[PDB]
């Protein structure tokens, strides 16, 4: 996976 998709996953996860 593009590491920026991972950065986008971390961003949404933090909203928890």
């Amino acid at each position, epitope marked *: 996976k*593009n*590491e*920026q*998709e*991972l*950065l*986008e*996953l*971390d*961003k949404w*996860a*933090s*909203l*928890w």
Partner: antibody, heavy 130, light 111 residues
Framework: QVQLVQSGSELKKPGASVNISCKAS????????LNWVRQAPGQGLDWLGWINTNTGNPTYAQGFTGRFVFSLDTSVGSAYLQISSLKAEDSAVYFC???????????????????????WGKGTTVTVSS | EIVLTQSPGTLSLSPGERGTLSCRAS???????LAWYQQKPGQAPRLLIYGASSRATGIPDRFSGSASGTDYTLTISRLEPEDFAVYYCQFYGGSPRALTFGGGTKVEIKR
């Protein structure tokens, strides 16, 4: 040999616009996000946000969601930061920086992943004065 | 937002001395993605340490990091003349994710 080349210094009047560029070299522009960091004269670093070089989607820091716009041009492997309705407070050095986000595990988290800016552009001075 | 307190703003040490810079966070430091940066006059910031203690490529071996509880620490085992500079800690974290920098610590030559 990884390098970010930023455009030259800019002199603008209050209310004008500026558009600064940052062109990648020695790496795939779309493989790494780019952060935009401002440093006002005699002040510390301020994160303006980041641009996903794979999708073009911009994330703006809390205080820069209005007059600041991040854009892309993957053809020239370059990213852009446009400030609108400039204010003397916008007077600062604007830096482009390659984000590195990697680690171990299915999901990224601070215990297993690293976030850091390894390559920085030399900076683009923007002086806003009437 | 998380606030990273770097104290003192000015750290006075002699060249050759061992230097430790503190980044004290308003919450647990390892709950974010950490890094130390160095900035010299007229230059871009330069990455030194990422995470708690991983040394970036090309960075001298005198630089090391440690993090426990609310304290993130950069150690310079022997200050060289080019090490007198401003140092910024980083915390990328928080619920609205945010890249937070400390206010910066200038390491100045004590004479």
């Amino acid at each position: 040999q990884v390098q970010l080349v930023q455009s030259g210094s800019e002199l603008k009047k209050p209310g004008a616009s500026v558009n600064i560029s940052c062109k990648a070299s020695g790496y795939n522009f779309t493989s790494h996000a780019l952060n935009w960091v401002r440093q006002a004269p005699g002040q510390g670093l301020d994160w303006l946000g980041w641009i996903n070089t794979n999708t073009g989607n911009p994330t703006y820091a809390q205080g820069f969601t209005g007059r600041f716009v991040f854009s892309l041009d993957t053809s020239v492997g370059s990213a852009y930061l446009q400030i609108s309705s400039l204010k003397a407070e916008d007077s600062a050095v604007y830096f482009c920086a390659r984000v590195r986000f990697h680690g171990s595990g299915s999901f990224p988290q601070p215990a297993d992943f690293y976030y850091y800016m390894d390559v920085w552009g030399k900076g683009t001075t923007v002086t806003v004065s009437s | 937002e998380i606030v990273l307190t770097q104290s003192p703003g000015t750290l006075s040490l002699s060249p050759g001395e061992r230097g430790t810079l503190s980044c004290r966070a308003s919450q647990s430091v390892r709950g974010g993605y950490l890094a130390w940066y160095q900035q010299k006059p007229g230059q871009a910031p330069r990455l030194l340490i990422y995470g708690a203690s991983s040394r970036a490529t090309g960075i001298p071996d005198r630089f090391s990091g440690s993090a426990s509880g609310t304290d993130y620490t950069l150690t310079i085992s022997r200050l060289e003349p080019e090490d007198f500079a401003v140092y910024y800690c980083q915390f990328y974290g928080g619920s609205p994710r945010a890249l937070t920098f400390g206010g910066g610590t200038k390491v100045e030559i004590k004479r």
